[PDB]
Design a protein around this ligand. Structure first.
Ligand SMILES: CC(=O)N[C@@H](C)C(=O)N[C@H](CCC(=O)N[C@@H](CCC[C@@H](N)C(=O)O)C(=O)O)C(=O)O
Ligand code: NA
Ligand code: NA
Ligand SMILES: [Zn+2]
Length: 414
């Protein structure tokens, strides 16, 4: 289930004041440098004129299973393709984005093995390898707004190479001269783009690099190309591997599953038991929201995994149950003060809480034992192993009516 997100200026008229870039990653589901780079771009950059359309992950089902491509190589499906291929509709969506008049340029991100060199050096460094290179299908595309691919590529490479972490990481140009007999690249995404008279580029980050360094180079390539296109932008951080690592591992990231409260992505216990999910609903249909763009759910054996790209954030052991939406709010005393707490919220507790009883609603405070409404509850009353978090501060309160699920509230002890 890929999606397209627009990064555009605040003033809608400014969209036509600079070029339009389509930024794509994750066509292989095991190349996280690309789709963590698109994720950070969406979360932390602003486009001040023009437009950058972003598909953060093209092959989302494969990403969720940490798999190169569950239905084969999606980047060989842009030429001949049987209408019955399982990804045929996804390919049509991708082609439609690429071919729209409102796109000038396309940048396709990949992670690749070893380090490309134009001459054979050794097993890791040679023309067959793909890491740390910037790729075009040909030097010029007649009829594009910016036909000079080579000039753009050379300048983008120069920009990246001004920021090398180690000298082995030096970027080189790879021109696949696709039209001149490269039957594999003839089936891939950027050649389709060139044939729609878009300027098209791919960036490769080496798989020999740690994720933060891969993402660093992908972001250098994006910035280099935006600079060549004269698409002005800002970002809310300094571009170095330390900062990239911090932003990937951002403790403010959350996931909201169905009508449940937001849970933090990071520092969840590895397994969460008896976790309510709506029954008779296929997992890909369960709404899941996040401030990140590469989060989802996927079935694995008898568990449901919460994924952040290729990272496993927790294993849900599901409790499939009817989600009754009639209960909107619950009266709770929080640190002596009565308040109406909405179902699906998180309430911070310094001292204590007390849930007011409701006639046909039963409350289970998970980790508290004696209906558990009508008890004054403090941190020392909790069995800490029932916490959602490694920090042992976040606990679930679940409401039932009374063979159906009426909702959840989280308490966080602060
Ligand atoms: C399909 C394949 O050859 N896989 C292995 C045996 C390999 O040689 N290299 C893999 C994959 C290389 C790769 O997938 N490289 C991309 C480049 C596409 C560039 C451009 N034409 C585009 O559409 O973005 C592609 O072959 O699809 C690696 O580096 O881990
Ligand atoms: Na070198
Ligand atoms: Na399904
Ligand atoms: Zn790839």
């Amino acid at each position: 289930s890929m999606e397209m997100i627009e990064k555009a200026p605040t003033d809608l008229e400014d969209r036509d004041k600079a070029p339009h870039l389509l930024l794509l990653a994750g066509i292989q589901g095991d190349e996280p440098g690309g789709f963590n780079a698109t994720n950070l771009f969406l979360m932390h950059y602003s486009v001040l004129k023009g437009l950058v359309e972003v598909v953060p992950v093209l092959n989302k089902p494969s990403m969720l299973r940490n798999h190169r491509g569950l239905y084969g190589d999606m980047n060989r499906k842009f030429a001949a393709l049987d209408k019955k291929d399982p990804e045929y509709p996804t390919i049509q969506e991708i082609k439609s984005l690429i071919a729209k008049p409102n796109i000038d340029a396309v940048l396709h991100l990949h992670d690749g093995g070893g380090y490309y060199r134009p001459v054979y050096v050794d097993a890791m460094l040679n023309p067959k390898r793909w890491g740390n290179c910037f790729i075009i299908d040909q030097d010029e595309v007649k009829g594009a707004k910016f036909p000079n691919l080579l000039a753009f590529a050379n300048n983008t490479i120069e920009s990246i190479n001004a920021h090398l972490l180690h000298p082995i990481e030096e970027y080189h140009l790879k021109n696949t001269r696709t039209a001149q007999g490269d039957t594999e690249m003839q089936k891939a995404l950027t050649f389709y783009a060139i044939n729609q008279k878009k300027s098209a580029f791919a960036n490769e980050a080496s798989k020999e690099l740690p994720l933060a360094s891969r993402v660093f180079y992908h972001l250098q390539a994006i910035e280099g190309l935006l600079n060549q296109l004269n698409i002005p932008f800002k970002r809310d951080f300094e571009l170095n591997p330390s900062s990239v690592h911090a932003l990937i591992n951002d403790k403010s990231l959350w996931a909201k599953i169905s009508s449940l409260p937001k849970i933090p992505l990071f520092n969840l216990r590895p397994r969460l038991n008896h976790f309510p999910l709506p029954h008779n609903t296929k997992i890909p249909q369960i709404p899941i929201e996040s401030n990140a763009y590469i989060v989802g759910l996927v079935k694995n054996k008898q568990e449901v995994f919460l994924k952040y790209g290729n990272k496993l954030m927790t294993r849900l052991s599901p409790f499939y149950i009817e989600f009754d939406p009639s209960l909107e709010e619950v009266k709770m005393q929080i640190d002596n003060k009565d308040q109406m707490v909405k179902i699906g919220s998180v309430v911070e507790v310094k001292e204590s809480f007390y849930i007011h009883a409701m006639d046909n609603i039963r409350a289970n405070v998970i980790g508290f034992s004696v209906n558990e409404a009508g008890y004054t509850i403090r941190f020392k009353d909790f069995q800490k192993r029932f916490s959602l978090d490694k920090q042992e501060r976040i606990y679930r309160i679940e409401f039932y009516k009374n063979n159906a699920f009426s909702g959840m509230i989280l308490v966080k002890f602060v």
